[PDB]
Design a protein around this ligand. Structure first.
Ligand SMILES: O=C(O)c1nn(Cc2ccc(Cl)c(Cl)c2)c(=O)c2cc(Oc3ccccc3)ccc12
Ligand SMILES: O=C(O)c1nn(Cc2ccc(Cl)c(Cl)c2)c(=O)c2cc(Oc3ccccc3)ccc12
Lengths: 261, 260
């Protein structure tokens, strides 16, 4: 069909921009985690000793240092997601204020989606897959900090059972950015016309790439409720840390995103 | 077979008509709708409330914001039994582990109540007492410090949910998809729940394609609204624990309602 064909070209375009925007793809993450010979095995951090050994190999309190580590990686992800968003057709043509709103609300939902790529049951890849930090070591951190990652692992284990690949995820993250139910949006209709087109492209991609996977489209859109709950839970955890650690700085970029969310 | 999807759509519509007295078609006729054969009594004010209690026979009723809250709770307890009856008509539901049926109802009913509340709302108010009354959004915002923003978030949800222009035949399937959620906590056997929710999502997809052929990606937009339902529900429960810190200290009344 002429219309299918425009949907495949949109899918190829977004996958292309996704590869160019995100240095560590799920395909590379899965090669490192499942020990494929295409990639180097990571140094594993499971305790204080392996952590300090990590400083040497992969290149102030421990819970805090790991937390600032996450923080900076989040800032980097925000920069890669903002560069991907510019590639989404129509996005840069929107009201500048709506561009800002779509990024502010969308970026955390995208971070937890793509963070699932780097996770299994037992832990998470770090320093572009040169390291692996165990889930158990993260859960054993000091009182406020030991709970930060657990909800991300729980989402990730469920999300990964969908067995999406990068070409699926490129279209899904574009659908997330182009919501239009986000608060404070000036012109909802230009946003929903783009989301509509992205949702058509996602639906055909999943039919073609997962022809045996019944209602994968609906099952993936339902996962949007889990992303919203991880974001809401994470923000109220940051409100606790702000108050118990008055000496701990937050990046302004993260601060501007969380501002009246 | 697309015919077997048309079967459970029909079946769910028939059962939804039997379970829920005030359908969206009826609510709409009375609201923004004209159908001027019997206009609702409007509650806009303290004296409208007091007169309303007089005109409409209210089944609840032995401060003003407390008595409205109690009336809403009474309606919720009735809606739970209507939804429970509807659930038992969904193919496969009664064959699930009984603990899993109870779990699915326990977590589902709140999401269904707000879904169905939207049928009875416009941007200016909510229908009550089976469509015989109408409580204004302004009057509900006007109420005391905690009770003034219990209904507001549901109005904002309803305005947005109602823009989809679903009818009863669409909503009947949507409500079933909500109930058969495999992600409720403490479920013992997720497989048969996800397998029924699969079949229901197929039926809802086909229903929205046939019932709304010019409404692009309605299915996606409706599934996205489930994200908003969960937020409303989590936001509502936290507001409820503050209300359990004003209307403190009947014992048998306490029991009938409960958080459970
Ligand atoms: O740089 C990373 O990729 C990184 N990632 N994660 C998980 C994660 C979180 C958020 C996002 Cl968006 C991504 Cl993609 C990945 C960390 O938890 C993490 C922790 C760090 O702390 C230390 C500190 C001293 C030694 C060793 C590690 C350092 C770096 C990281
Ligand atoms: O009985 C009703 O229909 C009713 N409904 N709602 C909204 C609602 C809630 C849940 C569900 Cl599922 C639905 Cl579908 C609709 C109320 O808020 C409400 C408030 C009341 O308060 C008073 C008290 C004294 C006088 C006048 C009104 C009385 C009755 C009601």
């Amino acid at each position: 069909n002429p219309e299918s064909a425009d949907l495949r070209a949109l899918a190829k375009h977004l996958y292309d921009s996704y590869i160019k925007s995100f240095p560590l793809t799920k395909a590379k993450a899965r090669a490192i985690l499942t020990g494929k010979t295409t990639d180097k095995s990571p140094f594993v951090i499971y305790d204080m000793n392996s952590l300090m050994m990590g400083e040497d190999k992969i290149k102030k309190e421990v819970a805090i240092r790991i937390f600032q580590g996450c923080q900076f990686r989040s800032v980097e992800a925000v920069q890669e997601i903002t560069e991907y968003a510019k590639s989404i057709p129509g996005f840069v043509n929107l009201d500048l204020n709506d561009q800002v709103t779509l990024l502010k609300y969308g970026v955390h939902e995208i971070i937890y989606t793509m963070l699932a790529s780097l996770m299994n049951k037992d832990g998470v890849l770090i320093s572009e897959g040169q390291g692996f930090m165990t889930r158990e070591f993260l859960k054993s951190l000091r009182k406020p900090f030991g709970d930060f990652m657990e909800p991300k692992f729980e989402f990730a284990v469920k999300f990964n059972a969908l067995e999406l690949d990068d070409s699926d995820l490129a279209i899904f993250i574009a659908v997330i950015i182009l919501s239009g139910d986000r608060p404070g949006l000036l012109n909802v209709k230009p946003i929903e016309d783009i989301q509509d087109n992205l949702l058509q492209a996602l639906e055909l991609q999943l039919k073609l790439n997962h022809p045996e996977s019944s209602q994968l489209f609906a099952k993936l859109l339902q996962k949007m409720t889990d992303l919203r709950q991880i974001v809401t839970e994470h923000v109220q955890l940051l409100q606790v840390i702000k108050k118990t650690e008055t000496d701990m700085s937050l990046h302004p970029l993260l601060q501007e995103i969380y501002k009246d969310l």
